[PDB]
Amino acid sequence: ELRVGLEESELWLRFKELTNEMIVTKNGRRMFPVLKVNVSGLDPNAMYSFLLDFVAADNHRWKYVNGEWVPGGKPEPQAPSCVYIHPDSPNFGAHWMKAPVSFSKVKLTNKLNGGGQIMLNSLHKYEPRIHIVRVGDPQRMITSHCFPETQFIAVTAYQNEEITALKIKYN
């Protein structure tokens, strides 16, 4: 049976208990921690593509007030649909299952300046989601997998000094 498990969940939960933050910039910024998953239950003989997108978590934005994340007003219009294709795609199920699948090269940005980056709105909370797509499937079956341990708020600069120190400590 298809099983997708989050790698280094303990490290993600350290950031989440502080409310995790990810920097977005004009040219795009890579994530820390990096989203990595282990996969089992795929057909090793079949070929698949791994896709990544980011889902909004609330219908409001956030603000850091008195060292505390609080609801910070009505949200901006939803960011456009941005899908990141894992550069190993398409590949055999045996490839995806022999070692954890890392999305280390994806970049988060606040501009639609191309480059295959992910457009996010600052001060909004997002949750990464992974999609698995089989090549050649007339039913075009797709599997979606959410990871609530990896939720974060997009920021142009770190608000929580504990988050700033955490990023330096483990990266």
Establish if 91 lies at the interface with ligand IXB (CB under 6 A). no
Query: Whose Cβ is closer to ligand IXB: residue 48's or residue 64's?
Result: 48
Which residue has tokens 């993600």? 12
| Helices 9-17 + 161-170 axis angle, to 10 | 160
Given the rule CB under 6 A, which of 7-15, 28-36, 58-66, 135-143 is the region that contacts ligand IXB? 135-143
State which of residues 70, 139, 168, 171 lies at the interface with ligand IXB (CB under 6 A).
139
Task: Select the span of 22-30, 39-47, 53-61, 145-153 touching ligand IXB (CB under 6 A).
Answer: 39-47
The Cα–Cα gap between 121 and 61 comes to 9
- Residue 1 in contact with ligand IXB, rule: CB under 6 A: no
The answer to whether residue 45 forms part of the interface with ligand IXB (CB under 6 A) is no
Among 22, 23, 35, 42, binds ligand IXB (CB under 6 A): 42
Angle at 38 between CA 50 and CA 87, to 5 degrees: 30
Residue 25 makes CB contacts below 8 A (sequence gap 6+) with: 109, 110, 156
Q: Which of 148, 162, 136 is nearest to 67 (CA)?
A: 162
Identified binder of ligand IXB from the candidate list 122, 143, 147, 167, rule CB under 6 A: 143
Check binding of 101 to ligand IXB (CB under 6 A): no
For the chain, count helices (H), then strands (E): 3, 15
- Residue 40 lies near ligand IXB (rule: CB under 6 A): no
Q: What is the DSSP letter of 137?
A: -
Enumerate binding residues for ligand IXB (CB under 6 A).
Answer: 42-43, 46, 132-134, 137, 139, 141-143
